[PDB]
Enzyme design. Structure first.
Site, PDB file in Angstrom:
ATOM      1  CB  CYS A   3      -0.941  -0.037   1.208  1.00 38.35           C
ATOM      2  SG  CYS A   3      -0.155  -0.570   2.773  1.00 38.35           S
TER       3      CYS A   3
ATOM      4  CG  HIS B 184       0.873   2.087   7.787  1.00 40.10           C
ATOM      5  ND1 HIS B 184      -0.008   1.138   8.250  1.00 40.10           N
ATOM      6  CD2 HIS B 184       0.952   1.905   6.450  1.00 40.10           C
ATOM      7  CE1 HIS B 184      -0.441   0.409   7.241  1.00 40.10           C
ATOM      8  NE2 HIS B 184       0.129   0.853   6.137  1.00 40.10           N
TER       9      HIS B 184
HETATM   10  N1  LIG Z   1      -4.223  -4.448   5.565  1.00 44.63           N
HETATM   11  C1  LIG Z   1      -3.586  -3.609   4.761  1.00 44.63           C
HETATM   12  O1  LIG Z   1      -3.558  -2.412   5.014  1.00 44.63           O
HETATM   13  C2  LIG Z   1      -2.793  -4.161   3.543  1.00 44.63           C
HETATM   14  C3  LIG Z   1      -2.307  -5.482   3.520  1.00 44.63           C
HETATM   15  N2  LIG Z   1      -1.658  -6.005   2.367  1.00 44.63           N
HETATM   16  C4  LIG Z   1      -1.256  -7.424   2.347  1.00 44.63           C
HETATM   17  O2  LIG Z   1      -2.471  -8.174   2.206  1.00 44.63           O
HETATM   18  C5  LIG Z   1      -2.258  -9.477   2.781  1.00 44.63           C
HETATM   19  C6  LIG Z   1      -3.417  -9.691   3.729  1.00 44.63           C
HETATM   20  O3  LIG Z   1      -3.399  -8.690   4.768  1.00 44.63           O
HETATM   21  P1  LIG Z   1      -4.722  -8.410   5.602  1.00 44.63           P
HETATM   22  O4  LIG Z   1      -5.866  -8.574   4.695  1.00 44.63           O
HETATM   23  O5  LIG Z   1      -4.469  -7.084   6.214  1.00 44.63           O
HETATM   24  O6  LIG Z   1      -4.739  -9.531   6.739  1.00 44.63           O
HETATM   25  P2  LIG Z   1      -5.808 -10.475   7.416  1.00 44.63           P
HETATM   26  O7  LIG Z   1      -5.316 -11.261   8.563  1.00 44.63           O
HETATM   27  O8  LIG Z   1      -6.954  -9.612   7.706  1.00 44.63           O
HETATM   28  O9  LIG Z   1      -6.362 -11.423   6.233  1.00 44.63           O
HETATM   29  C7  LIG Z   1      -5.731 -12.604   5.734  1.00 44.63           C
HETATM   30  C8  LIG Z   1      -6.857 -13.600   5.582  1.00 44.63           C
HETATM   31  O10 LIG Z   1      -6.339 -14.801   5.000  1.00 44.63           O
HETATM   32  C9  LIG Z   1      -6.766 -15.909   5.791  1.00 44.63           C
HETATM   33  N3  LIG Z   1      -5.885 -17.078   5.525  1.00 44.63           N
HETATM   34  C10 LIG Z   1      -4.668 -17.320   6.056  1.00 44.63           C
HETATM   35  N4  LIG Z   1      -4.144 -18.480   5.617  1.00 44.63           N
HETATM   36  C11 LIG Z   1      -5.091 -18.968   4.822  1.00 44.63           C
HETATM   37  C12 LIG Z   1      -4.984 -20.142   4.064  1.00 44.63           C
HETATM   38  N5  LIG Z   1      -3.981 -21.007   4.202  1.00 44.63           N
HETATM   39  N6  LIG Z   1      -5.971 -20.367   3.179  1.00 44.63           N
HETATM   40  C13 LIG Z   1      -6.982 -19.518   3.046  1.00 44.63           C
HETATM   41  N7  LIG Z   1      -7.104 -18.424   3.801  1.00 44.63           N
HETATM   42  C14 LIG Z   1      -6.166 -18.105   4.713  1.00 44.63           C
HETATM   43  C15 LIG Z   1      -6.720 -15.307   7.172  1.00 44.63           C
HETATM   44  O11 LIG Z   1      -7.392 -16.019   8.213  1.00 44.63           O
HETATM   45  P3  LIG Z   1      -6.546 -16.295   9.602  1.00 44.63           P
HETATM   46  O12 LIG Z   1      -5.204 -15.370   9.794  1.00 44.63           O
HETATM   47  O13 LIG Z   1      -7.458 -15.775  10.840  1.00 44.63           O
HETATM   48  O14 LIG Z   1      -6.182 -17.726   9.759  1.00 44.63           O
HETATM   49  C16 LIG Z   1      -7.361 -13.972   6.940  1.00 44.63           C
HETATM   50  O15 LIG Z   1      -8.777 -14.106   6.926  1.00 44.63           O
HETATM   51  C17 LIG Z   1      -0.925  -9.437   3.513  1.00 44.63           C
HETATM   52  O16 LIG Z   1       0.115 -10.045   2.729  1.00 44.63           O
HETATM   53  C18 LIG Z   1      -0.678  -7.945   3.660  1.00 44.63           C
HETATM   54  O17 LIG Z   1       0.719  -7.630   3.848  1.00 44.63           O
HETATM   55  C19 LIG Z   1      -1.467  -5.186   1.244  1.00 44.63           C
HETATM   56  C20 LIG Z   1      -1.920  -3.864   1.278  1.00 44.63           C
HETATM   57  C21 LIG Z   1      -2.580  -3.360   2.401  1.00 44.63           C
END
Ligand SMILES: NC(=O)C1=CN([C@@H]2O[C@H](COP(=O)(O)OP(=O)(O)OC[C@H]3O[C@@H](n4cnc5c(N)ncnc54)[C@H](OP(=O)(O)O)[C@@H]3O)[C@@H](O)[C@H]2O)C=CC1
Ligand SMILES: NC(=O)C1=CN([C@@H]2O[C@H](COP(=O)(O)OP(=O)(O)OC[C@H]3O[C@@H](n4cnc5c(N)ncnc54)[C@H](OP(=O)(O)O)[C@@H]3O)[C@@H](O)[C@H]2O)C=CC1
Ligand SMILES: NC(=O)C1=CN([C@@H]2O[C@H](COP(=O)(O)OP(=O)(O)OC[C@H]3O[C@@H](n4cnc5c(N)ncnc54)[C@H](OP(=O)(O)O)[C@@H]3O)[C@@H](O)[C@H]2O)C=CC1
Ligand SMILES: NC(=O)C1=CN([C@@H]2O[C@H](COP(=O)(O)OP(=O)(O)OC[C@H]3O[C@@H](n4cnc5c(N)ncnc54)[C@H](OP(=O)(O)O)[C@@H]3O)[C@@H](O)[C@H]2O)C=CC1
Lengths: 334, 334, 334, 334
Positions: A151, A178
């Site tokens: 981001c 941030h």
């Molecule tokens: N949030 C932000 O501001 C930004 C984030 N990003 C990138 O986006 C990615 C996600 O971040 P974010 O959305 O914030 O994080 P989150 O923890 O909110 O979301 C990740 C999701 O993926 C799920 N997940 C994990 N492993 C699996 C798997 N093996 N199979 C299927 N689903 C799974 C998690 O569930 P659970 O962990 O509970 O097991 C969770 O629901 C990261 O790489 C981050 O660096 C990029 C830009 C902006």
């Protein structure tokens, strides 16, 4: 038209879904996450940061029903077992944060998808794209595992470009103040980064960022000229980049702002914005652009050193860029 | 020994009072504030950021009684009627935030005091001092109204002095990510500064600061070389300065930190500290130094542009410097 | 249709204005506040809690312009000089928080207004109305200075009415876990109330409330039966009422819940809402109803003691009731 | 004297360690957690809520060294492999939050420990104890898997007892306005409780508690007479219990408080405290008692329904009770 599948329905996965809703080019047909359909339906509908989703969300068996369309819900921890091919998913949004390494993300391609968009910096990806900066370098024939960067990189690159073309950057340092994310802790607990192990909402937490360096991925002329850090603060969303740079040319605040305003209305319209209002972070929650220049903060010392401050909604801006990227890819020939 | 009077018993007045308790040279004999003795006693005893005052606080008449000592409590909105001279008050700490112009602060000398210390940048002051940087420029005959500068200049000046004397500063820009103060609003409300008019605990609020320009008042060789802005964030205390500077000599991170570490251990011992621990703001709450270098954050690009990050408890560190200044003026002759 | 003037463009005044925008019957034509037009316009457009005002807002001279309409802005601290009548203001919304005494609010009538609505509990008011409860007692001849009660009373009254008619309230206690307001302090400072003198966003602050007793004004049968307290917490908006009561009849959660739901879709529609979703405060930010029963929280012990929990956006629910009262009054005659 | 082992070095484990330092009768000889020694050493020394540990802390190889004493640090996920007997640990403090069922908690006994203290409500435990209430029911030959109950129950029980013995509790409802814990989410994320799935620092989150019904475990007489809920709010530590109860006797506020005050200075001294100061939550941060009556809040309607409010440091008061329980069990013979 282009069928999209989302891996990881978290903060970015759900906001990509919201963003996709208003775009008729792309169509989300399935989501995979560790949570169940009912839990997911609840989190998609009510959001503490972005309010309720204006779309009817329901659960029909193990699937979500949004505005009458059934979205398949898979609970595959291993990407290799996703079978994207059976459901006709063309492009996959990799947003679990667990599969940023090429060897992991490619498992999607082997599962049936034609393109993978990793929603974060990656390793061994075919190409890292920042919309507005280098989507032209994308080759439909050669690139299949694409990175959409961070981001922060999406916020900095658009304006580092204009600053570089117009005046020339010799070197620069940056700092992103941030908002906290799900990678942090609510109360002091183990974390691989001892700073992020500390109660997120209680302190200003310095941490490292690679966003400064990553700009070289999309603007090669800036390799080795920028570096920086991040300061995580007690806000749930929206962030701001602070870039101090040594310019080649002698400039004025007026010249710099005018240059940025021009790009925001011309070439980078939609990616880069320009504001002269004395606003604060809350005012940017929901802005879909990648980088909004806070024109009032622009300063210059000795005509060669400059400070430019740009705002960005880390969840929304980014999620819109993922969807834009998907639509761009689809158009270039899937 | 030296009797002191505090005008404006707020965040800085009460913390100056707390700092004085641990100093045998100064003696606080009276305070003036719009609040009543009972309110002032309560607020002095229980503090949301610093905890309980370890001293007996009670009320006798309309006067405060701390550890057996009766402290005269006044309530004059006009400094000219405080009659400091009658109760033997030699030094007055001006911390209401309203009498920052020499003309107004001078009314204390009329009320009988010998010196006034303004706990903030002033207009027309006889001299502005940052302990450890220029206290040696204090002249007992010519300087009666002294400014102790802002909490931000007190953090920046000590290490900017070092960076300068050691490698030479060509130009630099700073940003202080700062905790909110009583000058902001809880909820959106009328304010001169439209940024500061917004709900303090809900946003990152860019605001202006003269703190970088003000360093030239204590280090004239740096006149016109620095500038900066501020960003108020959702934390109640502790701030951090982020300084980016173009140096004259080419350096390495190790050289920069070694210089900083040496000064923290030498001349600037007690004013500038040095840390190689990955800490967060909440850890510096109660710190009494003026500037604590976060060594793990020091960065350098092209051997000439450096980034230095320093922590500061805007309430405690500054309040201690006020007491140190009062003690230093007294020792020079009153 | 009916011309309205707002006295004190604060959180409630600006939100009464916003609510006024989607009501065809009333029309805001003038505002009076301590602030300037440019400031008033800035705060009207950008709101840290509710977002940008979706309307074109601008300043024309000393006046505001909002979607073509020019709103007259004045700055009279003494309500006697507002000259409401010269500009045709029929109804005045007294929301400064300073003129809650009839003798004070009546100055607007001396100024030319015809009816005054105090946006808070009052002293010697002609009548206290809670829409949906006793608005039918308004008499255009007898009442000129009206009170709309407190946000808490508007939340408590509607469901305490239902519960009382249905089962009979013998006695009950309430606690309102309330967001902080502009009456509190950011950091420790002087306040009449020593609890509210403490940093608002740092603690759970217990404080008094007359909300429970004030229900007797709109529901005499409940006189002497209810009482309660408040707990201000670190959220900037939305509150919840927690009522524990002793009923005369023996009940079940189902019955209590069916009774409340029935009223929400019946007589109290638009005032009382009912919810079976497991929502949290931020989900209610922006709700226009006065009370939304959190159905999942209803409990009963010994079939005689019940617990009912209701949410309320203290800014939006209230400002909408104010606009409703203005509209009702006018329909009854001015 | 008695050797203790801590399984799960999180918020409760580290705070039990801290409290333990202040007790000469107990000696923590080992800790088991998922994190490594360095991570654990850092988190023990610096606390965002409680400040720096007043002790000399270092990592000797893979062990902790605190004031000369070496603490064995283990990384076993399965308690069966812990081998407590091997190192002499008599009492194990089970504070992972994952082994509250007797089937898991007892694995410690099998690995060699003599007693297990579960720092939370348990399932099939030999006995649940609230110090000051029923510790005397502890049978050393029978009771080996003990539960210290919850922080809420430890707050309510002590005063529920006094009210009962003195006036007779017919029935009552309680609400605890609780600080967020590591069981909640920083930002909207999956959780079995859809309320706790929401951003912890952004809302008032109603959730369930079994702390009221659990009082029956320690004060059997009150079985079926109490019930309640919890409201998690944006504060990191310290909670407050709000109890509304139907009494058998006619009482006055003075009568109620006099009973409480006496108990605080009598039998329950050290467990129950009494306060007539108008304090706020931060003031109780660091409090070691289990419950502190906020005397100013005691209320009574019809002389029969009472409202009593009690503060409790959910981390500190509880950890102290855990250490008090360990010291007590040991006195009876291990
Ligand atoms: N949030 C932000 O501001 C930004 C984030 N990003 C990138 O986006 C990615 C996600 O971040 P974010 O959305 O914030 O994080 P989150 O923890 O909110 O979301 C990740 C999701 O993926 C799920 N997940 C994990 N492993 C699996 C798997 N093996 N199979 C299927 N689903 C799974 C998690 O569930 P659970 O962990 O509970 O097991 C969770 O629901 C990261 O790489 C981050 O660096 C990029 C830009 C902006
Ligand atoms: N907060 C911080 O971190 C720092 C602040 N400072 C400076 O110190 C000053 C005080 O700041 P701060 O302590 O935060 O503010 P506060 O508002 O906490 O304190 C100011 C106090 O002065 C009282 N007061 C106002 N006018 C008078 C008067 N005419 N006569 C007597 N008493 C009066 C105020 O009462 P009332 O509000 O009721 O009018 C208040 O109690 C400002 O110049 C500020 O810039 C310097 C360094 C750091
Ligand atoms: N916020 C809430 O949840 C609710 C509040 N209320 C009541 O509404 C009233 C205002 O509440 P709130 O909006 O929160 O308060 P605010 O402080 O936001 O608004 C009050 C406004 O009145 C202005 N004002 C004060 N004195 C004058 C004056 N003499 N002449 C002209 N304008 C003046 C203030 O300006 P300035 O500050 O520059 O002096 C301020 O902008 C209070 O009585 C409150 O109890 C009722 C229901 C809900
Ligand atoms: N916090 C409070 O206010 C109170 C909490 N409690 C109870 O105490 C318990 C602990 O809670 P709390 O300290 O708050 O939570 P934390 O999450 O901070 O503590 C749990 C600790 O145990 C570790 N852990 C998890 N699984 C294992 C395992 N398999 N083997 C070894 N260690 C493990 C965790 O590591 P990791 O982080 O990697 O998962 C973490 O360090 C819970 O039952 C809670 O209900 C009782 C009273 C008060």
């Amino acid at each position: 038209a282009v069928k999209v599948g989302i891996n990881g329905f978290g903060r970015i996965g759900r906001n990509v879904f919201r963003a996709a809703l208003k775009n008729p080019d792309i169509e989300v047909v399935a989501v995979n996450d560790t949570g169940g359909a009912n839990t997911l339906a609840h989190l998609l509908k009510y959001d503490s940061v972005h309010g309720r989703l204006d779309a009817e969300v329901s659960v029909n068996g193990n699937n979500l029903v949004v505005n009458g369309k059934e979205i398949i819900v898979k609970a595959e921890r291993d990407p290799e077992n996703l079978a994207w091919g059976e459901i006709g998913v063309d492009i996959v949004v990799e947003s679990t944060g667990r599969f940023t390494k090429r060897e992991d993300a490619a498992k999607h391609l082997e599962a049936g998808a034609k393109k993978v968009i990793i929603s974060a910096p990656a390793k061994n990806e075919d190409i890292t794209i920042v919309m507005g900066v280098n989507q032209d370098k994308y080759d439909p024939k050669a690139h299949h595992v694409i990175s959409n960067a961070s981001c922060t990189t999406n916020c900095l690159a658009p304006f580092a470009k204009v600053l570089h073309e117009q005046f020339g950057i010799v070197r620069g340092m940056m700092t992103t103040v941030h908002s906290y994310t799900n990678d942090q802790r609510i109360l002091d607990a183990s974390h691989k980064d001892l700073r992020r192990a500390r109660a997120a909402a209680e302190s200003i937490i310095p941490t490292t960022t690679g966003a400064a360096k990553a700009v070289a991925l999309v603007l090669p002329e800036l390799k080795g000229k920028l570096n920086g850090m991040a300061m995580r603060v007690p806000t749930p969303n929206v962030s701001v980049v602070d870039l101090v740079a040594e310019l080649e040319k002698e400039v004025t605040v007026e010249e710099v702002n005018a240059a940025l305003k021009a790009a925001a209305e011309g070439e980078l319209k939609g990616i880069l914005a320009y504001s002269e209002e004395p606003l604060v972070s809350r005012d940017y929650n929901g802005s879909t652009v990648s980088s909004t220049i806070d024109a009032l903060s622009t300063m210059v010392i000795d005509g060669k050193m400059v400070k430019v401050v740009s705002w960005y909604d880390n969840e929304t801006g980014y999620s819109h860029r993922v969807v834009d990227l998907a639509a761009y890819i689809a158009s270039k020939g899937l």
